[PDB]
Amino acid sequence: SPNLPPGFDFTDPAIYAERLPVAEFAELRSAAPIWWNGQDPGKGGGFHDGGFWAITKLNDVKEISRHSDVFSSYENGVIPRFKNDIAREDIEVQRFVMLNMDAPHHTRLRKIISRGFTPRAVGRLHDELQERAQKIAAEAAAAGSGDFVEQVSCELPLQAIAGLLGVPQEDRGKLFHWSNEMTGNEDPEYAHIDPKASSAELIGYAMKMAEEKADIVTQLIQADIDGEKLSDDEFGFFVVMLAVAGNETTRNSITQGMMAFAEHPDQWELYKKVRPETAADEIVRWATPVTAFQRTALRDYELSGVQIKKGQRVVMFYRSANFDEEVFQDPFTFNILRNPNPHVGFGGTGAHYCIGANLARMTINLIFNAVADHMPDLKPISAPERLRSGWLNGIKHWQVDYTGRLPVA
Numbered sequence: 001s002p003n004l005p006p007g008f009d010f011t012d013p014a015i016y017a018e019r020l021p022v023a024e025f026a027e028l029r030s031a032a033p034i035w036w037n038g039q040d041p042g043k044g045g046g047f048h049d050g051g052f053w054a055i056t057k058l059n060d061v062k063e064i065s066r067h068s069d070v071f072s073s074y075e076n077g078v079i080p081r082f083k084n085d086i087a088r089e090d091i092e093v094q095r096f097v098m099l100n101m102d103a104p105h106h107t108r109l110r111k112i113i114s115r116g117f118t119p120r121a122v123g124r125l126h127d128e129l130q131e132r133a134q135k136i137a138a139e140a141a142a143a144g145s146g147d148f149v150e151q152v153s154c155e156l157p158l159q160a161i162a163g164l165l166g167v168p169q170e171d172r173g174k175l176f177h178w179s180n181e182m183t184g185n186e187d188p189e190y191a192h193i194d195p196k197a198s199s200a201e202l203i204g205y206a207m208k209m210a211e212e213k214a215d216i217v218t219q220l221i222q223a224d225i226d227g228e229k230l231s232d233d234e235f236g237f238f239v240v241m242l243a244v245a246g247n248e249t250t251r252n253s254i255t256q257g258m259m260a261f262a263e264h265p266d267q268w269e270l271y272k273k274v275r276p277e278t279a280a281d282e283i284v285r286w287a288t289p290v291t292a293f294q295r296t297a298l299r300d301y302e303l304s305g306v307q308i309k310k311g312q313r314v315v316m317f318y319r320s321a322n323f324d325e326e327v328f329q330d331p332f333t334f335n336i337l338r339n340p341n342p343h344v345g346f347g348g349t350g351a352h353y354c355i356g357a358n359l360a361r362m363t364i365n366l367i368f369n370a371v372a373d374h375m376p377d378l379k380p381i382s383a384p385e386r387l388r389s390g391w392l393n394g395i396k397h398w399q400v401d402y403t404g405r406l407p408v409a
């Protein structure tokens with residue numbers, strides 16, 4: 001029996017609006033590393049199956065991620081929490097993007113799309129993203145103080161997506177406005193936003209992009225050496241998946257990496273001098289922007305002595321796995337030189353491992369270089385405001401003094 005409150009649910013958005021449940025994950029790793037998280041009827045975040053297995057250890061997250069024949073992404077999608085009254089069809093519509101497909105459909109799409117994430121493809125974005133990062137940090141520093149999320153974290157992930165796709169400069173504002181409405185949450189600050197309508201507008205825009213382009217886009221829509229290509233429709237769903245996979249994730253890694261530097265000033269001093277490229281992985285481990293994704297067992301499977309049954313969901317808590325005391329040396333220390341760094345912030349190794357990981361790391365290293373260049377003495381003004389979501393670990397706002405000159409308490 002682990003020591004938790006009765007009825008505790010690790011996917012409860014009301015927890016994450018205030019804090020990460022770090023103590024509770026540490027209790028599970030220690031005492032019940034695979035634990036049945038029951039959910040009362042009508043309180044399952046859109047799932048009506050009585051609860052899920054909480055997976056808290058890094059080795060178990062890797063084993064589930066490897067065995068995608070047993071642990072399905074398609075069956076229930078991979079997001080483990082929606083509003084409790086969501087219609088089943090709105091969970092199943094996720095199946096149109098590759099993250100929520102199984103083999104064979106997933107395998108074909110992943111092989112085709114991997115073309116867009118070659119070393120050359122990602123490297124071709126470096127210089128424009130470096131220039132853009134420099135101006136973002138300089139403009140924020142010139143403002144003196146402001147919301148770090150909006151003025152520092154937000155723009156570069158969006159420009160990385162826009163650059164990868166070759167989106168015309170004049171269309172970036174509208175693309176960014178759709179993208180910022182599309183990853184749903186349950187936060188009252190965004191309750192009036194409709195993610196469906198924006199997703200639909202982005203699909204239309206992308207299908208036309210495919211029509212007109214007829215960089216990475218040409219490669220994806222033309223037959224490759226094994227004869228495969230995206231239809232315009234599949235290209236539309238590919239663009240939607242980038243808009244949701246690569247926006248708030250990287251953005252939250254930037255905000256929480258800065259929050260870590262503020263908490264660990266010796267690491268920030270070391271970073272500013274040395275700018276180690278290993279920093280990006282430690283920032284992703286520390287930030288764990290996706291707290292959890294799930295799978296559904298398609299057959300009975302014994303996982304580390306626990307008998308998972310056909311049809312049951314398993315929720316991989318990357319936030320727990322990334323602090324696994326058996327894997328990391330002193331996981332509760334932020335160490336920008338950590339190497340190796342076998343974190344699962346981009347997933348456990350397997351078929352769905354984040355295809356954007358190198359682009360995310362480049363975006364993170366470029367923005368931190370620019371922050372070091374333009375605002376080396378930044379200090380926070382007030383505590384971060386966290387996002388109400390049961391699976392995304394988000395920071396909505398964080399007021400900072402970029403100059404470090406204002407008085408602090």
Ligand code: HEM
Pocket residue numbers: 065098099100110160161164241242245246247249250253284288289290293345346347348349350351352353354355356357359360
């Ligand atoms: C720090 C930022 C990021 C984090 C933490 C993150 C995390 C993840 C995770 C956890 C998964 C699922 C892995 C699995 O199920 O094993 C994933 C998949 C994916 N990510 Fe990322 N990601 C980030 C940035 C990006 C970026 C910048 C892009 C592209 C612009 C991107 C594109 C994708 C795509 C297309 C998938 C689906 C892959 C598949 O299903 O085969 N991600 N990411």
Ligand SMILES: C[C@H]1CC[C@H](C(=O)N[C@H](Cc2c[nH]c3ccccc23)C(=O)Nc2ccncc2)CC1
Pocket residue numbers: 079090091093094096097099182183184195196199240244245246
């Ligand atoms: C046409 C169809 C609409 C649903 C799209 C989708 O799956 N969006 C969901 C959030 C979500 C889940 N169910 C939905 C229903 C409507 C609108 C949004 C959602 C989403 O934001 N997913 C996500 C996955 C990985 N990383 C970050 C975010 C894929 C394309």
